[PDB]
Structure formats: structure tokens, C-alpha cells
């Protein structure tokens, strides 16, 4: 139930310990790159980061974060299994989580899946 997410730039999604926004900038998956997948009901998931806080879409109004203390909503996502075995994540605003190729903090404001919105994943163990 613990995973990492590897973005388009081959880097790993980084919680940044809840200090600022999340980035897809880590060269290897260590503690801040591991997320506990939480079954949130209704076929949705949430993600709890290294700091015990929850990943938020921020409804696409600003870059994604991992510092919400509880799940509401903007903290639940549809897990989309892609044909190649990658995953995409659709926030509750209907937009997709984007690595932004590591050039800016991760966002959830894209209406369609492109390369930056596809992640390789694996159970951390």
C-alpha cells in the first residue's frame, strides 16, 4: 500500500515534507517520495505522505501540496490504469495530476492526459 510515482522526466514525485508545493524532482525514491495509498471509498484514493499529511489537488488553483491534515474534498483521486501499465490521477475537479516535466511544481489543472500526466509506479517494498 506504499508506492512511489516516477514522472515523465524519470524523476520521482516528492512531498517536499509539506514545505511548499510538491515537485517531481527526486533522482531516487526515498522517504519523501513514498506515499501510502488510502482507499477513500467510491472508487477513490487518497495519498498520505512522509509527514502524515495528505496530498491535495488544491482544486487546480495553485500547485499541489502535501500538507492537509485530513482528507476532504480535494484530497481524493481517481486512479486511472493506462494501457502501458502507467497510472494517471484525476482530481475531484476532473483534471489530471501533471509532473510538469519537473520545470515547475506539480499541478492538477490539465483536462486531458499527456506524457507529463502519466506516472510509472511500484509498491515501495
Author numbering: 888 to 1012
Text from the published report:
To probe the mode of binding of CBM92 domains, we successfully determined the protein structures of the C. pinensis proteins CpCBM92A and CpCBM92B by macromolecular crystallography. As was predicted by sequence analysis, both proteins form a β-trefoil structure comprised of 12 β-strands arranged into 3 subdomains (α, β, and γ), similar to β-trefoil domains found in Fascin and CBM13 proteins. We present crystal structures for two exemplary proteins cloned from the genome of C. pinensis, CpCBM92A and CpCBM92B, in complex with ligands. These structural data reveal three distinct carbohydrate-binding sites on the protein surface, with one site found within each of three structural subdomains (α, β, γ). The binding cleft Arg residue in the β-subdomain of CpCBM92B is found in subdomains β and γ in both CpCBM92A and -B, but is substituted with a Ser in the binding clefts of subdomain α in both proteins. This substitution in the α site leads to a substantial increase in accessibility around the glucosyl unit’s O2, which may permit binding to oligo- or polysaccharide extensions from this position. For CpCBM92F and AaCBM92B, which both lack one functional site, binding is compromised compared to wild type CpCBM92A and CpCBM92B, which both have three binding site Trp residues.
